[PDB]
Symmetry: C3
């Protein structure tokens, strides 16, 4: 089972390595992988027209099940992504020997009382609720060539990358609020109850969603640095029920566009 | 797979719709489904003996893994689900909610009335109280407006009109997988999470009923107070035995049966104004 | 499937029952199952060389998914040792990880489970090197559907619905502290609540903070599914955790911190767990050696 998993990752890398060589005149060794969140696929527009970026549909990459975009962004070579199957790409791209940072954005509901729709949250910690229970990207035989059997997550979110994100906001004069908080991963509907939202808040949750965390864990297992940004799309209602008696994408675009330059 | 799953739902509806036409001279279009939990099978007697009710066994209905009772209750056409399926039995969440989807294809049901036993997490609850659910926590669903306010006002008005002295709390129901009863720390955790009562059922049916567009009224029978005190320490010279006050299935059964009569009358009054 | 599980259970029992009769001139009726954590394999040394102990590899036992069962006498008492355990993060089902308990139960002699593990310290007063006698647990994955009793009930072993507020026998814990005093062991043995999480990641800061407010004193990746299964069989349970590290719970350094603490500082490692488990192993082996003689 892991053997077929291994070959599918090698097959996917073999394909991507070949197309890169055939496409780019210079050896394209991307320093970053950018996971464009829900409604943040415009980031591909900030890719440079010269050299001509390479676009690979997932349909043509072995093992994959969406497109991969290999180009330059503010001068830096990057990859764009527009449970072991959702993290098969990170392992495949890792075999290029060049990526050392994952930048992942997402939409997230606000659980911290001080958050409002439109605010941003720079993720500096997470709660992987399915991972605690048995829905884990690392469950099963360990990929020894990639990382250790037991991986620490208390160092998941690189401090220097977050300090860089905040400097690029002040430089870009972006007024939008950006917080620093914990992101809770639930495999549960945004249709969370008010009691569920309340439990999450007291559980130590600042923003909540259904993404990012499995990719963060897989990247950290591969040794990459991780920078994670959340767009607070709504404020989760946490009050008890009645008793019977589109602009922020631009800011996220420019913030990343600046950050990738100094990676 | 969803296609072969959709065929079973359609197959179940075709079966049930066929039997209703054969059995009832007049068209039978039930307005509410009543899922009877632990010890609420006495509601079957509140079904009018005329017109003669139709009884369908699960083994005979396609897709079902207990019996369906179709009849009139306080003048209203209803379906009784005698015997529910539980996730702790190994079944998938889809199998446990397939009956709701099959019955939804009749186009007439618009209310789910569901009861179940529950352990009391709210410290002021006692065995014998009921809890009108107005919110829930779906623990298996997450880490792995739903309760119609007017039906809740209807329930309390029917308690006052029937002069039922039994307490009826309003609070949050926590759905956990079971089949273990909670350890002391788990209950203390559920309490600080905002739990009022905890059970091993109901929330999947509620979520499926809301998906079908049904109004939902959920009533929890508090059969026991969850043990929350830390256990006896090995340094205690006068320790409370760790077995003291432990939950049992027998306690759940007995306390459910004692509250059945009040619950049956409460539902009997509710369906008439549904 | 339960019928497939039963045949597997009876098949493993018939296998073990046979090799017990061929090997031991006397009838070998073990009274306790000892599950040895990682780094606690030294307990196999306290098994007497006479009568000759029997060793069955998991590879040969049907159902058992290198790990081995050691059948012998410890402090004169007949015991069975689970040298190495199965973990859910390896890809096994909880039913597979606790299948050995069911098979051994069919010998009709074991009424005590002694289970050891390593654990990170969530209780802030804990330190690496301390022991924690378990007197309660939090089975959060069980609350969320990952439960060893999920599926059709083994009606020949125990009830469909099982209380866990009485999971950790009181006399067995008093006996453990009695043996600590009797042996002049100076190591700290706390009493507290163990929390089972799936792994294989070590906890994030926020995850550990969630465990603390939830009532956790020590967090590990094993034990509870075996304890639940042993209780379902009607066994008494003594569980001993080894505090191998102090979970990092402080929030990570903020971007606005002028003098930030390195986020890697204090990070848990597997080397740290193995090495601290190895240092406290002798005390643990001798505690268990004394206890098995009085169950
Ligand atoms: N989790 C939980 N459920 C219940 C229930 C609900 N049902 C009680 C019945 C027998 O245990 C199962 O169908 C679950 C009553 N008391 C409790 C309790 O203390 N805890
Ligand atoms: N979850 C968790 N488990 C452990 C354990 C128990 N196991 C011991 C082994 C060492 O990495 C892993 O399987 C975890 C020791 N320390 C910790 C900790 O901090 N956390």
């Amino acid at each position: 089972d892991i053997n077929e998993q291994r070959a599918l990752i090698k097959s996917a890398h073999r394909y991507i390595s070949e197309k890169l060589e055939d496409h780019f005149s210079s050896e394209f060794l991307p320093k970053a992988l950018v996971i464009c969140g829900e409604g943040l696929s415009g980031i591909s527009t900030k890719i440079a027209d010269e050299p001509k970026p390479l676009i690979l549909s997932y349909s043509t990459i072995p093992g994959f099940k969406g497109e991969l975009i290999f180009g330059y962004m503010n001068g830096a070579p990057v990859v764009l992504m527009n449970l072991a199957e959702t993290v098969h790409p990170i392992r495949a791209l890792h075999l290029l020997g060049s990526i050392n940072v994952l930048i992942v954005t997402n939409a997230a509901g606000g659980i911290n009382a001080s958050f409002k729709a439109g605010d941003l949250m720079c993720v500096y910690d997470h709660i992987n609720f399915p991972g605690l229970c048995g829905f884990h990207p690392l469950r099963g035989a360990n990929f020894d060539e990639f990382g250790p059997r037991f991986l620490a997550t208390s160092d998941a979110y690189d401090l220097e990358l977050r300090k860089l994100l905040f400097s690029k906001k002040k430089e870009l004069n972006i007024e939008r609020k950006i917080h620093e908080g914990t992101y809770s991963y639930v495999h549960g509907p945004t249709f969370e109850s008010r009691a569920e939202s309340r439990f999450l808040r007291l559980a130590g949750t600042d923003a909540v969603g259904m993404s990012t965390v499995p990719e963060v864990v897989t990247a950290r297992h591969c040794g990459w640095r991780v920078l994670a940004l959340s767009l607070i799309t709504n404020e989760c209602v946490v009050d008890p029920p009645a008793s019977a008696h589109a602009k922020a994408s631009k800011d996220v675009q420019e913030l990343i566009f600046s950050v990738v330059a100094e990676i």
